Amino acid sequence: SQVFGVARIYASFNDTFVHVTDLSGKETIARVTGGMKVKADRDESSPYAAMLAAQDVAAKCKEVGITAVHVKIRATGGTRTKTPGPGGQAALRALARSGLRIGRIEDVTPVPSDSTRK
């Protein structure tokens, strides 16, 4: 009965991205980042900004007809921090509180597997 998108929450420091696409990932439904909701240019990563971005994400997903999302939560990864910023749990909580059902939370940050440091 549910229609499933995916969440693609990329929560670095300095910013968060709440970007629902379809089940493939080819077609996007309301990418809104954290720094476009309220910008003091340093509160972009804040839980308030992630809650605002996930809330109007869930507005447009209920508009299009998506009832549930599979959550893919990633950090900046690479040769860098690998820990999700303060916005990841806030964006997930706001997506669940704003009507969308949550399924399949998974951690898809890019572990660099022998990287390019030195």
Partner: peptide, 8 residues
Amino acid sequence: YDPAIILK
């Protein structure tokens, strides 16, 4: 009911 607490 907290979706993100399983990560912590």
